[PDB]
Amino acid sequence: NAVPRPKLVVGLVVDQMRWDYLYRYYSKYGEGGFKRMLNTGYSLNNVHIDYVPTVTAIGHTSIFTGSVPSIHGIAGNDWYDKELGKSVYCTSDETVQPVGTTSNSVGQHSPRNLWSTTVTDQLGLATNFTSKVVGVSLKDRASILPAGHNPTGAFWFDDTTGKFITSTYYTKELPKWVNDFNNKNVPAQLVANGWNTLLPINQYTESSEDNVEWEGLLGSKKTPTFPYTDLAKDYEAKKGLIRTTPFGNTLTLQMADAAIDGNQMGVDDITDFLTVNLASTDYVGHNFGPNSIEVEDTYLRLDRDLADFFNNLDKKVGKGNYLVFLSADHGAAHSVGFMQAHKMPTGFFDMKKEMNAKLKQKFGADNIIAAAMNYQVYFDRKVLADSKLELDDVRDYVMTELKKEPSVLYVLSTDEIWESSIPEPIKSRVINGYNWKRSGDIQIISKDGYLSAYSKKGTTHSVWNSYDSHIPLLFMGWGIKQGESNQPYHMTDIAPTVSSLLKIQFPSGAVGKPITEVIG
Ligand SMILES: [Zn+2]
Ligand SMILES: [Zn+2]
Ligand SMILES: [Zn+2]
Ligand SMILES: [Zn+2]
């Protein structure tokens, strides 16, 4: 007379995975990774992110809350907090201590900026907190936010030591199974032989040439080309280097396997929840771009690691006893230099300094703009009051100046989003992404293909356009029929779907709805 439930559900989010990575490299994947999810599970091929900006902290938050920044409070990886008078990192919390490391900047993090509950929170509430909930990622934000407010543990990678650590928000000390894993020095083992392509490099016909102008550098090498023979020496000097290799994903999945065993995840009938973010596809993509040989090799190597991961699930939990959903927190644009080489619309988006000089000339006061980030601009309320300036005047001028920019498609006040002459889906995505306390006073929408000038190599992601917002969404295992769909869905539909499969209450700020055709 019990509610039918899987023994374990695994939430995998491949960082920066554009949907078309599934098919650009389709002919090179094996049978047990992405193709196992496609061939035995359900693929939603028309899922878009229903907010902006399409960055990491929000993506992981919205996947697991079914909510939007306007409600759940995570308005980006960073945001300007006008009451604190400074920019704020999404997970930074100076009321906790590092656990397993002495670095405060690496370990002082918590989910305290998250206002809405997660599906992992709701599982704990539905099982009287007998459920094992563990988050794993190289990035603090991508481990903490999916895990929720009261998980068994949330672990992330310490660049200063090469170990997985946590904070006193979770436990006073690292569990034995984490110390055991760290002491193996898996990172050293992985980078020992450098980085060569898994296949013969001549076969990477889905990619550009190896040496192109728009690709960044890795480690000590001064050309963006294989082979990366000095990886082991470079990793030793900077252990954060492993983030920008396929071995960062391999490390993460071995850590996730250690979490399954260290917490007995999936052995009894009480549903456990493992969340793991694969961050290296984002680091590699940021440095080399979606058309690089580097990125293609990262996905061929991730594909094999996922096959090993699913095979370990079959032995430790049992096929049919676990539920997997795979998605991404966002896509990515093509590199500006790549698009220019092929005549596609593209370009680059120092606004705070430049506009403040103009605002200075126009109104006579300096530092009128407090911050410019996430395609928004914040005005310094302290400067406006002391200078006797109106927010609307100062805002109207900046918007008029921004309309002149060749990269600007729309500019609008965040007080007047609904009435603006902007089509859907852009208008509602701007609404969903606008958090009253933590978002700026002006919203900017860039033309297609334009990227930030923060780095003129590699690529980035933040915009509404389909290349950033079109994410894969694959379900596999317990309670999932095989199939695929081109019906439109939202990222905020993921958590409601898992909630319905588990017969648990939806998260507290959820705005999405279950994907009914998946539940079979
Ligand atoms: Zn990301
Ligand atoms: Zn290259
Ligand atoms: Zn259990
Ligand atoms: Zn990124």
Coordinates of C-alpha atoms and ligand atoms in Angstrom, one line a residue:
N1 CA 0.0 0.0 0.0
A2 CA 3.0 2.3 -0.6
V3 CA 3.4 5.1 -3.2
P4 CA 5.4 3.6 -6.1
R5 CA 8.7 5.5 -6.3
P6 CA 12.2 5.0 -7.6
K7 CA 15.0 4.3 -5.2
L8 CA 17.1 7.1 -6.6
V9 CA 16.7 10.0 -8.9
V10 CA 19.7 11.6 -10.6
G11 CA 19.6 15.2 -11.9
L12 CA 22.4 15.7 -14.4
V13 CA 22.8 19.2 -15.9
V14 CA 25.6 19.4 -18.5
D15 CA 26.9 23.0 -18.2
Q16 CA 26.6 25.0 -21.4
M17 CA 25.2 22.1 -23.4
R18 CA 23.4 23.4 -26.5
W19 CA 20.7 21.0 -27.6
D20 CA 22.4 20.3 -31.0
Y21 CA 25.4 18.8 -29.3
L22 CA 23.2 15.7 -29.2
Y23 CA 23.1 15.5 -33.0
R24 CA 26.2 17.3 -34.3
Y25 CA 28.4 14.5 -32.8
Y26 CA 25.7 11.8 -33.1
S27 CA 27.7 9.6 -35.4
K28 CA 30.7 9.5 -33.0
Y29 CA 28.8 8.8 -29.7
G30 CA 28.8 5.3 -28.3
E31 CA 25.7 3.3 -27.4
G32 CA 25.6 3.7 -23.6
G33 CA 25.7 7.4 -23.1
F34 CA 23.6 10.1 -24.7
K35 CA 22.3 7.5 -27.2
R36 CA 21.1 5.3 -24.3
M37 CA 19.0 8.2 -23.1
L38 CA 17.7 8.9 -26.6
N39 CA 17.1 5.2 -27.4
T40 CA 15.5 4.1 -24.1
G41 CA 14.1 7.4 -22.7
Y42 CA 12.1 10.5 -23.6
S43 CA 13.7 13.5 -25.3
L44 CA 12.0 16.9 -25.4
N45 CA 13.6 18.6 -28.4
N46 CA 11.8 22.0 -28.0
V47 CA 12.6 23.2 -24.5
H48 CA 13.6 26.8 -23.9
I49 CA 14.6 28.8 -20.9
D50 CA 11.8 31.2 -20.0
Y51 CA 13.9 34.0 -18.4
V52 CA 17.0 36.1 -18.9
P53 CA 19.9 36.1 -18.3
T54 CA 20.7 32.5 -19.3
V55 CA 23.6 32.0 -16.8
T56 CA 24.6 29.2 -14.5
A57 CA 23.3 30.1 -11.0
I58 CA 19.8 30.8 -12.4
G59 CA 19.8 27.8 -14.6
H60 CA 20.5 25.3 -11.8
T61 CA 18.1 27.2 -9.5
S62 CA 15.3 27.2 -12.0
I63 CA 15.7 23.6 -13.0
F64 CA 15.3 22.5 -9.4
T65 CA 12.7 25.1 -8.2
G66 CA 10.5 25.3 -11.3
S67 CA 10.6 29.0 -10.7
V68 CA 12.0 32.2 -12.1
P69 CA 14.4 34.9 -10.8
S70 CA 11.5 37.2 -10.1
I71 CA 10.3 34.8 -7.4
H72 CA 13.2 32.6 -6.2
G73 CA 15.7 35.5 -5.8
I74 CA 18.7 34.1 -7.7
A75 CA 19.1 36.9 -10.2
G76 CA 22.4 35.7 -11.7
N77 CA 25.8 34.4 -10.8
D78 CA 26.3 37.9 -9.3
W79 CA 24.0 40.8 -8.8
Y80 CA 24.2 44.3 -7.4
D81 CA 22.5 44.6 -4.0
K82 CA 21.7 48.3 -3.5
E83 CA 21.2 47.9 0.3
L84 CA 24.6 46.3 0.7
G85 CA 26.0 48.8 -1.8
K86 CA 28.0 46.3 -3.7
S87 CA 28.0 43.3 -6.0
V88 CA 27.0 40.0 -4.4
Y89 CA 28.0 36.4 -5.4
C90 CA 25.0 34.0 -5.6
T91 CA 26.2 31.6 -2.9
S92 CA 28.7 33.7 -0.8
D93 CA 27.9 33.5 2.9
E94 CA 30.3 34.8 5.5
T95 CA 28.4 33.4 8.4
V96 CA 29.7 29.9 7.6
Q97 CA 33.2 28.4 7.6
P98 CA 35.1 26.2 5.1
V99 CA 35.0 22.5 5.8
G100 CA 37.9 20.5 4.4
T101 CA 39.9 23.6 3.3
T102 CA 41.2 26.7 5.0
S103 CA 40.3 29.0 2.1
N104 CA 37.4 31.3 3.0
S105 CA 36.8 32.4 -0.6
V106 CA 36.4 28.7 -1.7
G107 CA 34.4 27.4 1.3
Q108 CA 32.2 30.3 2.6
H109 CA 29.1 29.4 0.6
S110 CA 25.5 28.4 1.3
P111 CA 22.0 28.4 -0.3
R112 CA 20.8 31.3 1.8
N113 CA 20.1 33.6 -1.1
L114 CA 17.6 31.2 -2.5
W115 CA 14.0 32.1 -1.5
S116 CA 12.0 29.3 -3.0
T117 CA 12.2 25.6 -2.2
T118 CA 13.7 23.0 -4.5
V119 CA 12.3 19.7 -5.6
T120 CA 15.1 18.3 -3.4
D121 CA 13.7 20.3 -0.5
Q122 CA 10.2 18.9 -1.3
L123 CA 11.5 15.3 -1.3
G124 CA 12.9 15.8 2.1
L125 CA 9.6 17.4 3.3
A126 CA 7.7 14.4 1.8
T127 CA 9.9 11.7 3.5
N128 CA 10.3 13.3 6.9
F129 CA 13.9 14.0 5.8
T130 CA 14.8 10.4 5.6
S131 CA 15.9 10.9 2.0
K132 CA 19.6 11.2 1.1
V133 CA 20.2 14.4 -0.9
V134 CA 23.7 15.1 -2.2
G135 CA 24.9 17.7 -4.7
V136 CA 28.2 17.5 -6.6
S137 CA 29.9 19.9 -9.0
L138 CA 33.2 21.6 -9.6
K139 CA 31.4 24.9 -9.1
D140 CA 30.0 25.9 -5.7
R141 CA 26.9 27.5 -7.2
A142 CA 26.1 24.4 -9.4
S143 CA 26.3 22.0 -6.3
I144 CA 24.7 24.2 -3.6
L145 CA 21.7 25.5 -5.4
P146 CA 20.3 22.2 -6.9
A147 CA 20.9 20.5 -3.5
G148 CA 18.5 22.9 -1.7
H149 CA 18.3 24.2 1.8
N150 CA 18.8 21.0 3.8
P151 CA 20.5 18.2 1.9
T152 CA 22.7 15.5 3.3
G153 CA 25.6 17.3 1.7
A154 CA 26.7 19.6 -1.0
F155 CA 30.3 19.4 -2.3
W156 CA 32.4 21.5 -4.6
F157 CA 36.0 21.6 -5.9
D158 CA 38.8 23.6 -4.1
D159 CA 41.2 25.0 -6.7
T160 CA 43.8 25.5 -4.0
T161 CA 44.1 21.8 -3.0
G162 CA 42.4 19.7 -5.6
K163 CA 39.9 18.3 -3.1
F164 CA 36.1 18.3 -2.8
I165 CA 35.0 20.4 0.2
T166 CA 31.9 22.0 1.8
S167 CA 30.9 24.5 4.4
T168 CA 29.6 24.5 8.0
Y169 CA 26.2 25.2 6.6
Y170 CA 26.1 21.5 6.0
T171 CA 28.3 19.7 8.4
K172 CA 31.1 20.4 11.0
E173 CA 33.5 18.0 9.3
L174 CA 33.9 16.2 5.9
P175 CA 32.5 12.7 5.9
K176 CA 34.9 9.8 5.9
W177 CA 33.9 8.9 2.3
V178 CA 34.9 12.4 1.1
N179 CA 38.3 12.3 2.8
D180 CA 38.8 8.8 1.4
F181 CA 38.0 10.1 -2.2
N182 CA 40.2 13.2 -1.9
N183 CA 43.2 11.2 -0.6
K184 CA 43.2 9.1 -3.8
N185 CA 44.2 12.3 -5.7
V186 CA 42.0 11.4 -8.7
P187 CA 42.7 14.7 -10.4
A188 CA 46.5 13.9 -10.6
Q189 CA 45.7 10.5 -12.1
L190 CA 43.4 12.0 -14.7
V191 CA 45.7 14.7 -16.1
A192 CA 48.9 12.5 -15.9
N193 CA 49.0 11.7 -19.6
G194 CA 48.0 15.2 -20.9
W195 CA 45.1 15.8 -23.2
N196 CA 45.0 14.2 -26.7
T197 CA 41.8 13.7 -28.7
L198 CA 40.0 10.4 -28.0
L199 CA 39.7 9.7 -31.7
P200 CA 42.3 10.5 -34.4
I201 CA 42.2 14.3 -34.6
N202 CA 41.7 14.1 -38.4
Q203 CA 38.2 12.6 -37.8
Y204 CA 36.9 15.7 -36.0
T205 CA 35.2 16.8 -39.2
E206 CA 32.3 18.4 -37.3
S207 CA 34.7 21.0 -35.9
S208 CA 36.8 23.7 -37.4
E209 CA 40.6 23.5 -37.8
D210 CA 42.6 23.1 -34.6
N211 CA 44.5 26.4 -34.8
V212 CA 42.0 29.2 -35.3
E213 CA 42.2 32.9 -34.2
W214 CA 39.0 32.8 -32.1
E215 CA 40.1 30.1 -29.6
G216 CA 41.7 30.8 -26.3
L217 CA 44.7 29.2 -24.6
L218 CA 44.9 26.3 -22.2
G219 CA 47.6 26.0 -19.5
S220 CA 51.0 26.9 -20.6
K221 CA 50.6 26.2 -24.4
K222 CA 50.6 29.3 -26.6
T223 CA 48.5 28.0 -29.5
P224 CA 44.9 26.6 -29.1
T225 CA 46.0 23.2 -30.5
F226 CA 46.4 19.6 -29.5
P227 CA 48.3 18.0 -28.0
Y228 CA 48.3 19.5 -24.5
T229 CA 51.4 17.7 -23.3
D230 CA 52.2 19.9 -20.3
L231 CA 48.8 19.4 -18.6
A232 CA 50.1 17.5 -15.6
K233 CA 52.8 20.1 -15.0
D234 CA 50.3 22.9 -15.5
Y235 CA 47.7 21.3 -13.2
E236 CA 50.3 21.0 -10.5
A237 CA 50.9 24.7 -10.6
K238 CA 47.2 25.6 -10.9
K239 CA 44.8 22.9 -9.8
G240 CA 41.9 24.9 -11.2
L241 CA 43.2 24.0 -14.7
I242 CA 41.3 20.6 -14.6
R243 CA 38.1 22.5 -14.8
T244 CA 38.9 23.4 -18.5
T245 CA 39.6 19.7 -19.5
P246 CA 37.3 16.7 -20.1
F247 CA 38.9 15.3 -16.9
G248 CA 36.9 17.8 -14.9
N249 CA 33.8 15.9 -15.9
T250 CA 35.4 12.5 -15.3
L251 CA 36.4 13.7 -11.8
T252 CA 32.9 15.0 -11.0
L253 CA 31.3 11.7 -12.0
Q254 CA 33.8 9.6 -9.9
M255 CA 33.0 11.9 -7.0
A256 CA 29.3 11.3 -7.7
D257 CA 29.9 7.5 -7.6
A258 CA 31.7 8.0 -4.3
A259 CA 28.6 9.9 -3.0
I260 CA 26.2 7.0 -4.0
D261 CA 28.3 4.5 -2.0
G262 CA 29.2 6.9 0.8
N263 CA 25.5 7.6 1.5
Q264 CA 24.0 4.3 0.5
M265 CA 22.0 6.1 -2.2
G266 CA 19.4 4.0 -3.9
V267 CA 19.7 0.8 -1.8
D268 CA 16.4 0.9 0.1
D269 CA 12.9 2.1 -0.9
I270 CA 13.2 5.6 0.5
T271 CA 13.8 7.8 -2.6
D272 CA 17.2 9.5 -2.7
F273 CA 18.3 12.4 -4.9
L274 CA 21.7 12.9 -6.4
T275 CA 22.4 16.2 -8.3
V276 CA 25.6 16.5 -10.4
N277 CA 26.6 19.4 -12.7
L278 CA 29.1 18.6 -15.4
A279 CA 31.0 21.9 -15.4
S280 CA 33.9 21.2 -17.8
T281 CA 31.7 21.5 -20.9
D282 CA 31.2 25.1 -19.8
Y283 CA 34.9 25.9 -19.1
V284 CA 36.0 24.3 -22.3
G285 CA 33.2 26.0 -24.3
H286 CA 34.0 29.4 -22.8
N287 CA 37.6 29.1 -23.9
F288 CA 37.3 27.5 -27.3
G289 CA 33.8 27.9 -28.5
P290 CA 31.2 25.3 -29.7
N291 CA 33.0 24.6 -33.0
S292 CA 36.4 23.7 -31.6
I293 CA 37.9 20.3 -31.6
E294 CA 38.4 20.8 -27.9
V295 CA 34.6 21.0 -27.3
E296 CA 33.9 18.0 -29.6
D297 CA 36.4 15.9 -27.7
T298 CA 34.9 17.0 -24.4
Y299 CA 31.5 15.7 -25.4
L300 CA 32.9 12.4 -26.9
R301 CA 34.7 11.9 -23.5
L302 CA 31.7 13.0 -21.5
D303 CA 29.5 10.5 -23.5
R304 CA 31.8 7.7 -22.5
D305 CA 31.8 8.8 -18.8
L306 CA 28.0 8.9 -18.8
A307 CA 28.0 5.4 -20.2
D308 CA 30.2 4.3 -17.3
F309 CA 28.0 6.3 -14.9
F310 CA 24.8 4.7 -16.0
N311 CA 26.4 1.2 -16.0
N312 CA 27.4 1.8 -12.4
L313 CA 23.8 2.8 -11.6
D314 CA 22.6 -0.5 -13.1
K315 CA 24.9 -2.4 -10.7
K316 CA 24.5 -0.3 -7.5
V317 CA 20.8 0.6 -7.8
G318 CA 19.4 -1.6 -10.6
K319 CA 17.9 -0.8 -14.0
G320 CA 14.3 0.4 -13.6
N321 CA 14.9 1.4 -10.0
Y322 CA 16.3 4.9 -10.7
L323 CA 15.2 8.0 -12.6
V324 CA 17.5 10.2 -14.6
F325 CA 16.8 13.6 -16.1
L326 CA 19.6 15.3 -18.1
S327 CA 19.4 18.9 -19.2
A328 CA 21.5 22.0 -19.3
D329 CA 21.5 25.4 -17.6
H330 CA 21.9 27.2 -20.9
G331 CA 23.4 26.8 -24.4
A332 CA 26.1 29.0 -26.0
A333 CA 26.6 31.2 -29.0
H334 CA 29.2 30.7 -31.7
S335 CA 32.4 32.6 -31.3
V336 CA 32.4 36.1 -32.8
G337 CA 35.5 35.3 -34.9
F338 CA 33.9 32.0 -36.1
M339 CA 30.8 33.8 -37.2
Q340 CA 32.7 36.6 -39.0
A341 CA 34.7 34.0 -40.9
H342 CA 31.4 32.6 -42.2
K343 CA 29.6 36.0 -42.7
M344 CA 27.0 35.4 -40.0
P345 CA 25.5 38.3 -38.0
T346 CA 27.7 38.8 -34.9
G347 CA 29.7 41.4 -33.0
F348 CA 30.5 42.6 -29.5
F349 CA 28.2 44.2 -27.0
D350 CA 33.0 49.3 -21.0
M351 CA 29.4 50.6 -20.5
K352 CA 29.7 51.7 -16.8
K353 CA 32.8 53.8 -17.3
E354 CA 31.7 55.2 -20.7
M355 CA 28.1 56.0 -19.8
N356 CA 29.1 57.5 -16.5
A357 CA 31.3 60.0 -18.4
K358 CA 28.3 61.0 -20.5
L359 CA 25.9 61.0 -17.5
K360 CA 28.6 63.2 -15.8
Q361 CA 28.6 65.6 -18.7
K362 CA 24.8 65.7 -18.9
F363 CA 23.9 65.9 -15.2
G364 CA 27.1 67.0 -13.5
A365 CA 27.5 64.1 -11.0
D366 CA 29.9 61.2 -11.1
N367 CA 29.3 57.5 -10.6
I368 CA 25.5 57.8 -11.3
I369 CA 25.6 54.2 -12.5
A370 CA 26.5 51.9 -9.6
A371 CA 26.8 48.7 -11.7
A372 CA 26.3 47.3 -15.2
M373 CA 25.8 43.5 -15.4
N374 CA 23.5 40.8 -16.6
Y375 CA 22.5 43.2 -19.4
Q376 CA 21.1 45.6 -16.8
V377 CA 22.3 48.9 -15.3
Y378 CA 21.8 49.9 -11.7
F379 CA 21.8 53.6 -10.6
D380 CA 23.5 54.6 -7.4
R381 CA 20.6 55.8 -5.2
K382 CA 23.1 57.5 -2.9
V383 CA 24.5 59.6 -5.8
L384 CA 21.0 60.5 -7.1
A385 CA 19.8 61.8 -3.7
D386 CA 22.9 63.8 -2.9
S387 CA 23.0 65.2 -6.4
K388 CA 19.2 65.9 -6.4
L389 CA 18.6 63.8 -9.6
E390 CA 15.5 61.9 -10.6
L391 CA 15.8 58.2 -11.3
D392 CA 13.5 58.6 -14.3
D393 CA 15.5 61.5 -15.9
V394 CA 18.8 59.7 -15.4
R395 CA 17.2 56.5 -16.7
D396 CA 15.6 58.0 -19.8
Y397 CA 18.9 59.5 -20.9
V398 CA 20.8 56.2 -20.6
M399 CA 18.0 54.4 -22.5
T400 CA 18.1 57.0 -25.3
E401 CA 21.9 56.7 -25.6
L402 CA 21.7 52.9 -25.6
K403 CA 19.2 52.9 -28.5
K404 CA 22.0 54.3 -30.7
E405 CA 24.3 51.3 -30.1
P406 CA 24.6 48.9 -33.0
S407 CA 24.4 45.9 -30.7
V408 CA 21.2 47.0 -28.9
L409 CA 17.8 45.5 -30.0
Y410 CA 15.7 46.8 -27.1
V411 CA 16.2 49.0 -24.1
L412 CA 13.5 49.5 -21.5
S413 CA 12.8 50.4 -17.9
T414 CA 12.2 47.5 -15.6
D415 CA 9.3 49.5 -14.2
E416 CA 7.6 49.4 -17.6
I417 CA 8.2 46.0 -19.1
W418 CA 4.6 44.8 -19.7
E419 CA 3.6 47.9 -21.7
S420 CA 6.8 48.0 -23.9
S421 CA 6.6 47.4 -27.6
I422 CA 8.4 44.1 -27.4
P423 CA 7.2 40.7 -28.8
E424 CA 6.9 37.4 -27.0
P425 CA 8.6 35.4 -25.8
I426 CA 11.1 38.2 -25.0
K427 CA 8.7 40.3 -22.9
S428 CA 7.6 37.5 -20.5
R429 CA 11.2 36.3 -20.2
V430 CA 12.2 39.8 -19.1
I431 CA 9.3 39.8 -16.6
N432 CA 10.3 36.3 -15.3
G433 CA 14.0 37.4 -14.9
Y434 CA 13.2 40.7 -13.1
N435 CA 13.7 40.4 -9.3
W436 CA 12.5 43.6 -7.7
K437 CA 15.2 43.7 -5.0
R438 CA 18.2 42.3 -6.9
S439 CA 17.8 43.3 -10.5
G440 CA 18.7 46.6 -12.2
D441 CA 16.7 49.6 -13.3
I442 CA 17.2 49.1 -17.1
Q443 CA 17.0 45.9 -19.2
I444 CA 19.0 45.6 -22.4
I445 CA 18.3 43.1 -25.2
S446 CA 21.1 42.6 -27.7
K447 CA 20.8 41.8 -31.4
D448 CA 21.3 38.2 -32.5
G449 CA 24.9 36.9 -32.4
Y450 CA 26.4 39.7 -30.3
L451 CA 28.5 38.7 -27.3
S452 CA 30.1 40.5 -24.5
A453 CA 33.5 42.0 -25.1
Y454 CA 34.7 40.7 -21.8
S455 CA 36.7 38.1 -23.7
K456 CA 37.1 38.4 -27.4
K457 CA 37.9 34.7 -27.7
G458 CA 35.9 31.6 -26.9
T459 CA 32.2 32.3 -26.3
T460 CA 29.7 33.1 -23.6
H461 CA 26.0 33.0 -22.8
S462 CA 23.3 35.2 -21.3
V463 CA 20.7 36.1 -24.0
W464 CA 17.2 35.0 -24.8
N465 CA 18.1 33.8 -28.3
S466 CA 17.6 30.1 -29.1
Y467 CA 21.3 29.2 -29.2
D468 CA 21.5 30.2 -25.4
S469 CA 18.0 29.2 -24.3
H470 CA 17.4 25.9 -26.3
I471 CA 18.5 23.2 -23.9
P472 CA 18.4 19.4 -24.1
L473 CA 16.0 17.6 -21.8
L474 CA 16.2 13.8 -21.6
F475 CA 14.3 11.6 -19.1
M476 CA 15.3 7.9 -18.6
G477 CA 14.5 5.1 -16.3
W478 CA 11.8 4.5 -13.7
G479 CA 8.4 5.7 -14.9
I480 CA 9.6 6.9 -18.3
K481 CA 8.4 5.7 -21.7
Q482 CA 10.6 6.0 -24.8
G483 CA 9.8 8.7 -27.3
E484 CA 10.4 12.3 -28.3
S485 CA 8.5 15.5 -28.7
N486 CA 8.7 18.8 -30.5
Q487 CA 6.0 20.4 -28.3
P488 CA 7.2 23.6 -26.7
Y489 CA 8.1 23.3 -23.0
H490 CA 10.0 25.5 -20.5
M491 CA 12.9 24.9 -18.2
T492 CA 10.5 25.6 -15.3
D493 CA 8.5 22.5 -16.4
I494 CA 11.3 20.1 -15.2
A495 CA 10.8 20.3 -11.5
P496 CA 7.0 19.9 -11.7
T497 CA 7.5 16.8 -13.9
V498 CA 9.8 15.2 -11.3
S499 CA 7.3 16.2 -8.5
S500 CA 4.4 14.4 -10.3
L501 CA 6.6 11.3 -10.9
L502 CA 7.4 11.2 -7.2
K503 CA 3.9 12.2 -6.0
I504 CA 5.4 15.1 -3.9
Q505 CA 4.2 18.7 -3.6
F506 CA 5.5 21.2 -6.1
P507 CA 8.2 23.6 -5.0
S508 CA 7.0 26.7 -3.3
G509 CA 7.6 29.2 -6.1
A510 CA 6.9 26.9 -9.0
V511 CA 5.4 28.5 -12.1
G512 CA 5.8 25.6 -14.6
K513 CA 3.7 22.5 -15.2
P514 CA 4.4 18.8 -15.6
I515 CA 5.4 17.4 -19.0
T516 CA 2.6 14.9 -19.1
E517 CA 3.7 13.0 -22.2
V518 CA 6.9 11.9 -20.4
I519 CA 5.1 10.2 -17.5
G520 CA 4.4 6.7 -18.8
Ligands
ZN1 ZN 26.4 27.2 -16.9
ZN2 ZN 41.8 24.0 -31.2
ZN3 ZN 17.2 5.5 0.2
ZN4 ZN 29.4 29.7 -18.5

